[PDB]
Structures are given as C-alpha cells and as structure tokens.
Amino acid sequence: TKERFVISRRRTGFGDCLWSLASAWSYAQRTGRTLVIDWRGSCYVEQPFSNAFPAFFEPVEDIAGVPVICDDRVNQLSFPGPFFPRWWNRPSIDCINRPDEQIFRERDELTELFQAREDSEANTIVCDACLMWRCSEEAERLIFRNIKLRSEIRARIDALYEEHFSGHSIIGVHVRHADSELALHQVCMAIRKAKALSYPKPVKVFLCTDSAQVLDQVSGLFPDVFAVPKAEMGIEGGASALIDMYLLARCATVIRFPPTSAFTRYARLLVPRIIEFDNPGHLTMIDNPY
Ligand SMILES: Nc1nc2c(ncn2[C@@H]2O[C@H](COP(=O)(O)OP(=O)(O)O)[C@@H](O)[C@H]2O)c(=O)[nH]1
C-alpha cells in the first residue's frame, strides 16, 4: 500500500486559494489521501518555484486528521501517477499549453469526481482549477480554524483591532474595483442602509478597497471611515490582503461589493449581517447568527 495524494494548486487571490484548499482537503479527508498545498507561482511571490504558503501561514503537518505537505518539499518529492484529471498524465512538453478551457474542463471533472461514490484509482489528484463552491461551508470554516497566519501578520491584525474595532460596532465595506459614478452611488446607499440598523456599540466604517480614489470619496462622504494603510512589495501586498480579509470577518455588518468576490467569503461565514446587491438595483440583507 502506497501513499496517495491530493494536490491543491492555486495562485490567485487568497479568498479563492483558501476556498479551493477546503475543497481539496475535503476530498483528501474522504479518501484517505495526503494533502499537498502547492502555491508555487502565486501572484504575491516574485520567485516562481517558491511555495507561497509558508510566506503567509505557519507550517502545518496535519489539518483535522489529514496529513499535509505545505512547504518547499513540493520541489523535492515526485508525486506518484497515474494522475487525475487525466491531462496530467500527458508528457510535460504537451502540458506547456494549459488554456482556460482546459482549466474549466478540469473544474468540471473534479466536480464530478467529488460527487461520485467511488474514489479515483489515480494515485495523485491534481487540483489546479477554481474549486469555489466545491465543498461544504463546514470544510471552509475548518480551514480557517486550522491554519494560522504568520505572527508578523497576526500582530498587525491585533494592533488594528485594538485601535479601531474594540469597543465599537464595525460596518465593513469591501469594494473591489458613468459606470464608476453609479457604483460609488450604490456603495453609498449600501453604507446608509447598514448605518440605519441598530448596533450595540458606537458605529465605525471599515473600508477595504483596492482603489485610492474610493477610499478618499467614501471617507469624504461618511464619518468615522478608516482603512488599513495600503519581491518585498509582493509579500507586503499579500499581507495587506490577509489583514483586510481577517478584519472584515470581525465586523458586525459586512457590505460585499460584489458578493461574488471570494475575498469576503470568510466574512460571509462569520459575520452576523451581510448586505449585498441582489433584482439589480436592489439591496438584500442576510442574517447569519448562523
Ligand atoms: N488589501 C486588499 N486587497 C484586496 C481587496 N480586494 C481585493 N484585493 C486583492 O485582490 C485579490 C482578490 O482575489 P480573491 O480574494 O480571490 O477575491 P475575488 O477575485 O474578488 O473573487 C485579493 O485576495 C487581494 O489580493 C481589498 O479590499 N484589500
């Protein structure tokens, strides 16, 4: 009997990476495989063969009973074939071309596998597609509770929490960016809706946006708006993303613009009230006690 594996490969934003990871974990758990977290080629890391996982999270060798490999051993180990999806059995020269259509086919093939009664006979499952929505919300919560941010990032979160969140009810606003005038108008309406709700503590607005113009505009339109200020630059970008993602999950209400963004998925799982645009033009509120 030989060790078998599920490899979770993802190189996009962390919301996507961590949700896709939960899907891979859940299959590994179901089928008695080792999970490999392979974030080589991450958008936040300049070096293309460095596993990005340990640049942001502490080493983990086990997640809820599933053995994990999450470090530079991905560059030393030969993960055994045959592989699934079957594209991964092709010669390397044939794997140079990996268009979106192949990636989307593999999403579908993995989805089918995950739903099937029988485990695959492949010794290694390679997950290198978006696996958002491909697991239970419980699997997603389990991931957030069983990996830990590096201490330098936690310390920043802890400082910001003490400075801004503590003693207050925070409305978190995620704005992922004639068109722009409307959209700013809609975000303003969402904030006004959120502010008209009752909170137990005095209200502040936490803005997370990837745009400078949005911060200046929203801050000029509402009181008590704050934000977290902004190779080495890739890692700082990643840290700043994680700080924002985690702090959003500590808000009393979160506004998701748009609610399709994985960035606010963690917040969506944890926060008591979520506001989003639905009937377009119209705002909906979700209660999540849970
Ligand atoms: N620091 C920071 N980065 C953001 C914010 N919104 C988006 N980003 C960056 O863009 C990436 C978005 O990808 P993901 O988290 O998968 O969310 P999605 O692409 O909007 O589904 C985030 O992980 C961040 O790296 C934000 O409010 N604050």
Buried b (16+ CB within 10 A) or exposed e, 216-255: ebbeeebeebbbbeeeeebbeebbbbbbbbbbbbbbbbbb
Please give all residues whose beta carbon lies within 6 A of any atom in ligand 1, as ranges: 12-16, 174, 176, 208-210, 240-241, 244, 261-263
Domain boundaries, given as residue ranges, for the chain: 1-149, 150-290
The tokens describing 52, both together, are 């990005």
> Which of 137, 88, 84, 90 is CA-nearest to residue 110?
84
Give 211 Cα–ligand 1 centroid separation in angstroms.
11
Fold match between domain 1-149 and domain 150-290: yes
What CA dihedral angle connects 246, 241, 222 and 165, to 10 degrees? Answer: 30
Going by CA atoms, what residue is nearest to atom 23 of ligand 1? Answer: 13
Q: Is 16 annotated as contributing to ligand binding?
A: yes
State how far the Cα of 134 lies from the Cα of 88, in Å rounded to an integer. 20
Top mutation candidate among 205, 263, 276 for ligand 1, by most atoms within 8 Å of CB: 263
Going by CA atoms, what residue is nearest to atom 22 of ligand 1? Answer: 13
The residues facing 34 across adjacent strands are 5
State how far the Cα of 149 lies from the Cα of 14, in Å rounded to an integer. 12
User: At which residue do the structure tokens 């963004």 appear?
Assistant: 261
Of 2.10.70.10, 3.40.50.11340, 1.10.10.10, 3.30.200.20, which CATH number belongs to 1-149? 3.40.50.11340
Backbone angles phi, psi at 7, to 5 degrees: -105, 125
How many Cα atoms occupy the beta-carbon half-sphere of 121 within 13 Å?
Answer: 1
Q: Is 261 annotated as contributing to ligand binding?
A: yes
Query: Which ligand 1 atom minimizes the distance to the CA of 228?
Result: 1
Give 212 Cα–ligand 1 centroid separation in angstroms.
14
Position 227: which residue type?
A: A
How far does Cα 26 stand from its chain's mean position? 16
List the 203-209 sheet strands across, edge first: 225-226, 203-209, 169-175, 253-257, 273-277, 283-287
Query: Which ligand 1 atom minimizes the distance to the CA of 174?
Result: 27
State how far the Cα of 20 lies from the Cα of 133, in Å rounded to an integer. 8
Per CATH, the number for 150-290 is 3.40.50.11350
Q: Which long-range contacts (CB under 8 A, 24 or more apart) does 197-203 make?
A: 197/253, 197/273, 199/169, 199/252, 199/253, 200/169, 201/167, 201/168, 201/169, 202/167, 202/168, 202/169, 203/168, 203/169, 203/170, 203/171
User: At which residue do the structure tokens 């699997």 appear?
Assistant: 139
User: At which residue do the structure tokens 């502040």 appear?
Assistant: 204
Yes or no: say if 64 and 29 are a contact pair by the CB < 8 Å rule.
yes
Give 286 Cα–ligand 1 centroid separation in angstroms.
22
Yes or no: say if 37 and 20 are a contact pair by the CB < 8 Å rule.
no
Resolution of the determined structure in angstroms stands at: 2.0
State how far the Cα of 263 lies from the Cα of 241, in Å rounded to an integer. 9
How many Cα atoms occupy the beta-carbon half-sphere of 288 within 13 Å?
Answer: 19
Give 255 Cα–ligand 1 centroid separation in angstroms.
14
Q: Is 15 annotated as contributing to ligand binding?
A: yes
Q: Is 168 annotated as contributing to ligand binding?
A: no
Q: Is 180 annotated as contributing to ligand binding?
A: no
